[PDB]
From Swiss-Prot, chain B:
InterPro entries: Capsid_Gp10A/Gp10B-like_dom, Capsid_Gp10A/Gp10B_dom. It comes from the Viruses. One of its GO terms (cellular component) is viral capsid. The lineage of its organism: Viruses, Duplodnaviria, Heunggongvirae, Uroviricota, Caudoviricetes. GO terms for biological process: viral translational frameshifting. This is Major capsid protein. Keywords: Capsid protein, Virion. Belongs to the T7virus major capsid protein family. The keyword Thylakoid does not apply.
Swiss-Prot record, chain C:
The N-terminus interacts with an internal region of the major capsid protein subunit in an adjacent capsomere (intercapsomeric interactions) to stabilize the capsid. Residues 130-134 are annotated as: Intercapsomeric interactions. It comes from Escherichia phage T7. One of its GO terms (biological process) is viral translational frameshifting. This is Major capsid protein. Assembles with the minor capsid protein to form an icosahedral capsid with a T=7 symmetry, about 60 nm in diameter, and consisting of 415 capsid proteins. The major and minor capsid proteins are incorporated into the capsid in about a 90/10 ratio respectively. Once the capsid is formed, encapsidates one single copy of the viral genome. It is found in: Virion. Pfam families: Gp10A-like. GO terms for molecular function: identical protein binding. Belongs to the T7virus major capsid protein family. Signal peptide: none annotated. Its main location: virion.
Length: 37, 300, 309, 296
C-alpha cells in the first residue's frame, strides 16, 4: 500500500534532521515497513 | 397549432443532438440554479495538524490556511441560429430536420469546449499548482510512429506521478488529446490487431483507461477568440499555449459553471430580405474556478 | 403469380448489397423527395455560434455574402442491367440469387463513385475569384512540389512529399473558414502504399490504425482516406485531355481531390423499382431497375486537389 | 441392416468432408440436378449508367462477348479404400472413425487442390503473377526475416487488386503450410501463444492488410497442371515461391445430387470394398487478374 503523504506528527521524530544519529529518520528514505498487531 | 408542436420536436432533436457531439458534459461541474446570474465555489485545501486537549481552545489552529471562496458568472449569451426557408418545414422533413439540427447542435459544443479548455492551461500559465513535462529537445528530431506513442506514454508515467503529492484521487479523470497525435497513435499502446473489445470502447467514443486518467479527444482546441492561448507565442513567459502544447490533463473537479433557463429556442419572421427564422439560446459559458493543480506537455 | 415474385425479392438484395458497398451514401449529404425531380438545400459559408451584450445585431457579414443556397435537379434515369434466361433464374434459389445480387451490387457502386468523383473534379474550371469579396472566395486547389515527379519513383520518394502536401491542406481549410471536421480526401488506389510506408517504416502493424470494418484510415492532419478506382478522374464532365489547357485540375497528373461535408448534393425519384421485358429480337428477358436521379450539383468553397508539377 | 451401418457411416463421411474441407465457401457453386453441365454470368463490373431521354445503348451491348462461361463435369471424382469386416461391427466404435476419415478427408483432398491449381495457369499465356522479393529465399533464412517482405507482397497484391475495379476486399491467402510461419513471425515475435490472435477461432486468420488469410498443407497436386516445371518460360510454377492469391468468384464447379455411397463384394482379395461418388471439377470463371508472388 503506497502512501499519499508521510508527514503529520506524533515528525515527532527528527524528520528535519539529516541524521543526528537516528538513521531511522524521515526524508532519508522510504523504507518504512511493518506487520500486523 | 401543429406548426407550433413541430418546434417541440425540433427542440427534442437538438438537446439530444448536443450529445454525441458531446465533448465535455460530465468530467466537470454544472448546476440548475434558477435566476442566479452568477454562482460561486469553495477553494480551501487538504491539510492537518496536531490535536485537542481538554485545555485551551481550537480557535487558533486555522490561522495559516487562508480559506478562499470563488465566484464566476455568465458572459454575454451563447448560440448561433439558422435561417430556414421552408415550406417543407412543416413536413416531409425526415432528412431536412436532421440536417438543420446538426448544424447548430455540434456548433454549440464546438464553442463550449475551448471556453472550458484553454483557460485551464491559463491557470497553469500565470507564473492550480503547476505542471509541465516533455521528452528530448524537439518534435523535429522525434518523428517516426510508435515512438510517438512511446515518449508520450513515458511522460504519462510522470503525469500519474504529479497527480499525487497535491493529493486528489485518481479515481476518475480524462485527457483531451489532439486527434493528430491521438491515441499514442494506438501503436505503442496497442501493438495488437483485432481487439478493441480488449481496449474496451463500448461506443461512447472513448478509449478505456490507461495508466492514469482516461484518453479521449475531439478535434484540436480553440475558443475565446470566437481568452489567451498564444499558439503563436513560443514562450514570452508563458509556454502552455498551443504550438506547442499536448493532449491535455484534467484534474478532478477543477471547473464547471452555471446555466440559467437551460436552453431556449426562439422562432421568428424577420422579413427585411428573408425567408423565416428560428432561435435557440444558451446563457452560460465560462472559464474559471481555481483548480487545485494541473498541467500539460511540450517539446523543448 | 410467382413469375412476378421472382421479380419481387430481387430489389431488396440489390439495395442491401449496395448500401454495404460504397465510398458514399455517407461522407456526403443525401436528400429525399416525393415526385420532385429537383430540389434545393443550403450551403455552409457562414456560421459558428457567438457571444455579445445587447449592444449590436449580426448579419452585416451575412449581407456581404454571395448567393445563399442554390437548387438542383434530376439528370436522366439510372440503371445497369443484363439479359437473362428465366427458368434457370427461377430455380437455383440460394446460389442463383446470390450470384445475381453480386453482379448488380458491383455496378451501382461503380456508377456512384464515378458520378461523385466527376462532379467534384468538375468543381473548379471557373475562375470566379479575383473580382469581388476577398474572403468570399474561395475554392481553387493545388499544392505542388514534387519536382514534376519524374526524378523519383520509389515508395518514400512519393507520398512523403505528399504528406508535405496536405500539410498545406488544413492551412487551406480554415483559410476559407468553414468547418474542418469530417474532411475526407478521397485518393487513388495505389501510391498510398507509399504513404503508409512513409508513416511507419518496417513494422508491418497495418492493423490498429486504418481501423477494422472500414477500409479507411483514422487521419493525417485529420481526414478520411479510401483507395478507390478511377485513377483517372470522372471524365467518364471532367476533362480527360488537357496537360494544362486551362484547367489545372487535370488528368493523370491528378491525385488529391479533397473535399468535405455539404459540398455535393442529389436526390431520388423514389427508393427503387424494377421491371423485365421481352424482345424477340434479342430473345430472352431484359431487366430494368428504376434508380439514382440527379447526382449533379455542388457548393464550394472547400474543394481542392494536388497533382505533381 | 448392413447398409444401415453405412447409413450412419456416410454422414461421418459427410461430416468428414466437413473440415479438412477448405471450401464450402470462399468461392461460387451451383445446385444443378440431372444436368451434366451448368452456367452462370460474369457481368463485367464496369460500365454504367445514367442516360439521356434518347439513346439506344448499342456497342455497350456489343463489345462484351459476355456470356456465362458454361462449364461441366470432368469424369468422376472420388477415391475409396479396401477393408476387411471384423472392424465392421458397430460395437467397437473408433472403427467408424479410422476408415471414414481416410475416405472423406480424401474426397476433399483433391478437388480443392485442382481448383487451386488452375489459378496459376490463369496466366502462363502469351492478370497478376506479379511480385519479386529480394533475390532469393536462400539469403533470408530465419523467420521474421521472411515475414516482412512476405507482408510487403500483400501491398502490391492490393495494388494489382485495384484498377481492375474488383473487390477483392474479400479474399484469403492460398499459401504454403510451412513457410506461412513468416506471417505470424513478423507479426508476433512476442508470443508465446498464437492461440487467440483475436479469432483464429475456426480455421481463419482474421484480416491482414486487407484480404482474409488461411493456408494449408497439400497443394502439391503454387502447383499447376504444369506444376513440376522448374522454370521453362513460365515462372508461375511451384517453388518459384509461395504467392498464390485470388478473390471472389474466380471459380467454383458443379454438384450432382450428392456423394451417396454403397458397397460390393470383390472376390479378389477381400472381405468387402466400399465406394462413394462425386461429380465435381475445375471451378470456373474469369481472369479477374489474380495470381501469385515470387522472387529472383
Amino acid at each position: 500500500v503506497e502512501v499519499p503523504h508521510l508527514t503529520a506528527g506524533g515528525h515527532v521524530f527528527p524528520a528535519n534532521k539529516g541524521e543526528g544519529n537516528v538513521k531511522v529518520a524521515k526524508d532519508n528514505v522510504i523504507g518504512l515497513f511493518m506487520h500486523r498487531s | 397549432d401543429k406548426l407550433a408542436l413541430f418546434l417541440k420536436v425540433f427542440g427534442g432533436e437538438v438537446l439530444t443532438a448536443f450529445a454525441r457531439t458531446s465533448v465535455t458534459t460530465s468530467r466537470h461541474m454544472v448546476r440548475s440554479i434558477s435566476s442566479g446570474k452568477s454562482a460561486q465555489f469553495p477553494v480551501l485545501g487538504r491539510t492537518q495538524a496536531a490535536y485537542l486537549a481538554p485545555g485551551e481552545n481550537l480557535d487558533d489552529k486555522r490561522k495559516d490556511i487562508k480559506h478562499t471562496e470563488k465566484v464566476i458568472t455568465i458572459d454575454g449569451l451563447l448560440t448561433a441560429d439558422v435561417l430556414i426557408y421552408d415550406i417543407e418545414d412543416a413536413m416531409n422533413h425526415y432528412d431536412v430536420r436532421s440536417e438543420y439540427t446538426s448544424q447548430l447542435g455540434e456548433s454549440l459544443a464546438m464553442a463550449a469546449d475551448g471556453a472550458v479548455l484553454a483557460e485551464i492551461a491559463g491557470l497553469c500559465n500565470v507564473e492550480g499548482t503547476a505542471t509541465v513535462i516533455e521528452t528530448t529537445q524537439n518534435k523535429a528530431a522525434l518523428t517516426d510512429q510508435v515512438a510517438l506513442g512511446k515518449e508520450i506514454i513515458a511522460a504519462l508515467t510522470k503525469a500519474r506521478a504529479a497527480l499525487t503529492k497535491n493529493y486528489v484521487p485518481a479515481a476518475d479523470r480524462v485527457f483531451y488529446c489532439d486527434p493528430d497525435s491521438y491515441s499514442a497513435i494506438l501503436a505503442a499502446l496497442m501493438p495488437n490487431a483485432a481487439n478493441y473489445a480488449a481496449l474496451i470502447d463500448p461506443e461512447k467514443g472513448s478509449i478505456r483507461n490507461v495508466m492514469g486518467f482516461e484518453v479521449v479527444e475531439v478535434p484540436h482546441l480553440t475558443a475565446g477568440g470566437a481568452h489567451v492561448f498564444p499558439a503563436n507565442k513560443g514562450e514570452g513567459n508563458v509556454k502552455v499555449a498551443k504550438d506547442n502544447v499536448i493532449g491535455l490533463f484534467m484534474h478532478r473537479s477543477a471547473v464547471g459553471t452555471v446555466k440559467l433557463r437551460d436552453l431556449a429556442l426562439e422562432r421568428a419572421r424577420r422579413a427585411n430580405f428573408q425567408a423565416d427564422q428560428i432561435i435557440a439560446k444558451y446563457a452560460m459559458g465560462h472559464g474559471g474556478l481555481r483548480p487545485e493543480a494541473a498541467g500539460a506537455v511540450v517539446f523543448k
